[PDB]
Amino acid sequence: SNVYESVIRAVHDSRSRLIDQHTVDMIGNTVLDALSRSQTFRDAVSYGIHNEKVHIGCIKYRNEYELNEESSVIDDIQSLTCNELYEGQEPIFPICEAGENDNEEPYVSFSVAPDTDSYEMPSWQEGLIHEIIHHVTGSSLGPTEILARRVAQELGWSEREAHLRLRNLNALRQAAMRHEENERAFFERLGTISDRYEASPDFTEY
């Protein structure tokens, strides 16, 4: 509860490295739902407090991506089009990792949120929690996937490699399509953040 507000502000402090407001909300909604309802997320979080691992409140969030080097497109992520997301030769996929900056502050990079009630949401949420789990439990594997599975089950959320890929793809697509009226800037925001550069925290470019 000391921790709910810290996380809320952490999420607010993450806007400039995230793709859209929708992703800002999904993150808030899911991390805090887990924190409230999931006995194993709470133990894992609590463990990190009491064992001098990462305090959830410190964790900030990013939508970092990178080029696919089995592609047949290059250039940059900031110069990609709706259509290129439809022509495993996919331009990009996101950096899904629990990292820390040069200043040793912990962050989670992960896919852009899919749309509410899409098929790919429950899996997205599980993934996000999984990466958080890496930080709070001190882990840089089986144990953490299992752990996240349990959280996902406790919360009622509904080959692995391929599935993971199409999930990460449409999520990109869904987000893109979301802003089709602002396509160019969406990608110029995405390319911006993937270059570890800080964008509009109020998404003024929408």
Place this chain on the structure above:
Amino acid sequence: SNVYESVIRAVHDSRSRLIDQHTVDMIGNTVLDALSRSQTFRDAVSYGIHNEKVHIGCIKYRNEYELNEESSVKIDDIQSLTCNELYEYDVGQEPIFPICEAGENDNEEPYVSFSVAPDTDSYEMPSWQEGLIHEIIHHVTGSSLGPTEILARRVAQELGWSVPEREAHLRLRNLNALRQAAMRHEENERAFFERLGTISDRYEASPDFTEY
């Protein structure tokens, strides 16, 4: 701290009288953003706790609607409403509008009924959000008019949100948010209105939105 968890669970417990997961989501985000960053809102919430008014963690959420009596179209009930009918006729002839109310049930337990939430990043979101805060302001300030109106605009400005003439804008915001919600569930159109009717009859629907 203590109130943040209380609210996340009020919301969770509010699901069965809420129209969809998006609205549940939007409510949660909006109330916690206000509680995190708005000094006026926190001042208002504190007051209610200290002075034996409503604790916010007490408050549940509803999307009750009532039929527009002054509407030409005859539909027997909400559950009977159709999308084309929604889309079909504009303000002043709309079948139903939101019940915006800071009420309580017969156990004196507090609730806020309010419009369904409009789409993410839509024109109506900021005003919706401000209106949700308004209704909560009524509970936590102990009230039952301009003072609360003013408090609410203040909260909205402190947070960076946007916004007779007022009524029209409001009435149009309400209707457009209903149209967006309706369109949001185009694959389950009949269930959308069945659920809206059930909530509007003051009965509980499934907390997991199993009809979608």
